[PDB]
Design a protein around this ligand. Structure first.
Ligand SMILES: [Pt+2]
Ligand SMILES: [Pt+2]
Length: 543
């Protein structure tokens, strides 16, 4: 039996949570209580199988069990079609109510009143809103969500304790979710071959000192971990993640110097810690690449005898000595390299043909460096909010077909690059910026996927995972596009209206001038300012 093998390895507590997540991600509209029942059933039944591994129905695969309980058009179908069904019925942008915390004391009452139902409530509410959230991590998040209610519902000021943590958790969760979503899209839309390269790139950067052989292994195991979490095999995802976190730490010496602190801590902490570690120190005298990948007489041979292992050895070798480069860059270079080997090793003298393959890189490297230098100059020259509006406008013109809420949402997140990254030294900027941008752009891509309007966005999204940022950056304003025919709010709130309006304002006269925007923007802000001052406000808002 299988249920048991998991229940055992994961423990009831975590089992129970995961199983919840699994469900709330699959059916996002279905009410809270409705799930908890299904959970508890599954949980009781598991226990039976723990007692009698040869009991009735314990012979089944988790998918079948889960799908079944859930089913109490997809349900008219059977494994595996059925599961793929639910997997493809996942909604990235549910019409689910805005999430809002009732007054502190109200929560602090409920937390002591019913501590379990309370956490299950949290997992439930997040999971249905982030159907691709990294299940294991969501546990970390939940424990740290408990830890704040434990403390802050037990102090002088609750509000100035609790809320400040919850603002940090929402932020962090939003990032993790978005980051994970990229992982899942990479896998599902570009296949594992592609994710593998990504991993090989990133891990070679986290763990420079590690021999290729080790990195390949890690990449395998990790790819397995994610594949599962994205295919909705969360239980196994978490176990496998654990087993991996346990592996890494045993062999620490051969991986990184940095892991010690991480490896010392509990199951949940360390998996996150590790995920988040700093890059190990760049090893000393590493023979220049060119020797083995340009000067060698056996390039054209090794690319024949093992293109994958060779190109991997390459990606590895280049990545480990470039923590300054984005992953997506490194991938591009890798692609350029593959490409060029292809053409050259079909020539008269290949040694000659490919000999200059590094010259090809200068462009691909520079194109990003400039772009970052410039909008970091810009960022510091504008500050984050204003900075967001420039991106807003820039992009809105590029893709005036995209829904306003999406435009706002994405723009704003593009905005944070500046504050996130521009404070770092150049050395650490690009991998910060570009790879963050690659996440944000993926949010666009998926939100867009749902309800497609703009062949340009689609082109960029589907054509190549790695070249998206350049594809988008490239885009000039859309000429084809046919122009489109409260006071008691927080700053962040006011911002999102103003911005929302800004988009409509651009959609109205795309061939606007920054000045005749300044003019309309201001006008309207003044309008709202006056109509806030009061009388019969609504009578004022008459226009
Ligand atoms: Pt959220
Ligand atoms: Pt090698």
């Amino acid at each position: 039996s299988e249920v048991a093998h998991r229940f055992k390895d994961l423990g009831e507590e975590n089992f129970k949570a995961l199983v919840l997540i699994a469900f709330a991600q699959y059916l996002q509209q279905c009410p809270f209580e409705d799930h908890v029942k299904l959970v508890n059933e599954v949980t009781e039944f598991a226990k039976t199988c723990v007692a009698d591994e040869s009991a009735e129905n314990c012979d089944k695969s988790l998918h079948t069990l889960f799908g079944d309980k859930l089913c109490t058009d997809c349900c008219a179908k059977q494994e595996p079609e059925r599961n793929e069904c639910f997997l493809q019925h996942k909604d990235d942008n549910p019409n689910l109510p805005r999430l809002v915390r009732p007054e502190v004391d109200v929560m602090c009452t409920a937390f002591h009143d019913n501590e379990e139902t309370f956490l299950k409530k949290y997992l439930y509410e997040i999971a249905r809103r982030h159907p691709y959230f990294y299940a294991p991590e969501l546990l970390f998040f939940a424990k740290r969500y408990k830890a704040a209610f434990t403390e802050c519902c037990q102090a002088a000021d609750k509000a100035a304790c609790l809320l400040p943590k919850l603002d940090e958790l929402r932020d962090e969760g939003k990032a993790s979710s978005a980051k994970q979503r990229l992982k899942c899209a990479s896998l599902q839309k570009f296949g594992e071959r592609a994710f593998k390269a990504w991993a090989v790139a990133r891990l070679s950067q986290r763990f420079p000192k590690a021999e290729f052989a080790e990195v390949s292994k890690l990449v395998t195991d990790l790819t397995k971990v994610h594949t599962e979490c994205c295919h909705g095999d969360l239980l196994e995802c978490a176990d496998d993640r654990a087993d991996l976190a346990k592996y890494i730490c045993e062999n620490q010496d051969s991986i990184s110097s940095k892991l010690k602190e991480c490896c010392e801590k509990p199951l949940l902490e360390k998996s996150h810690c590790i995920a988040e570690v700093e890059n190990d120190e760049m090893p000393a005298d590493l023979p220049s690449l060119a020797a083995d990948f340009v000067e060698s007489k056996d390039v054209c041979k090794n690319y024949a005898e093992a293109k994958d292992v060779f190109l991997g050895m390459f990606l590895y070798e280049y990545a480990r000595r470039h923590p300054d480069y984005s992953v997506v860059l490194l991938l591009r270079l890798a692609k350029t390299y593959e490409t060029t080997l292809e053409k050259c090793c079909a020539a008269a003298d290949p040694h000659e043909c490919y000999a200059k393959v590094f010259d090809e890189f200068k462009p691909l490297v520079e194109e990003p460096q400039n772009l970052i230098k410039q909008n970091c100059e810009l960022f510091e020259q504008l500050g984050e909010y204003k900075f967001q509006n420039a991106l807003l406008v820039r992009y809105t013109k590029k893709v005036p077909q995209v829904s306003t809420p999406t435009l706002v949402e994405v723009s704003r997140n593009l905005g944070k690059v500046g504050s996130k990254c521009c404070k770092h030294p150049e050395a650490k900027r690009m991998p910060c910026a570009e790879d963050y941008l690659s996440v944000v752009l993926n949010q666009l891509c998926v939100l867009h996927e749902k309800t497609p309007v703009s062949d340009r966005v689609t082109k960029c999204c589907t054509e190549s995972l790695v070249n998206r940022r350049p594809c988008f950056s490239a885009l000039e304003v859309d000429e084809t596009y046919v122009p489109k025919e409260i006071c008691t709010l927080s700053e962040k709130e006011r911002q999102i209206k103003k911005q929302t309006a800004l988009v409509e304002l651009v959609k109205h006269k795309p061939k606007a001038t920054k000045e005749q925007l300044k003019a309309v923007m201001d006008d309207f802000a003044a309008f709202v300012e006056k109509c806030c001052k009061a009388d019969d406000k609504e009578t004022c808002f008459a226009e």
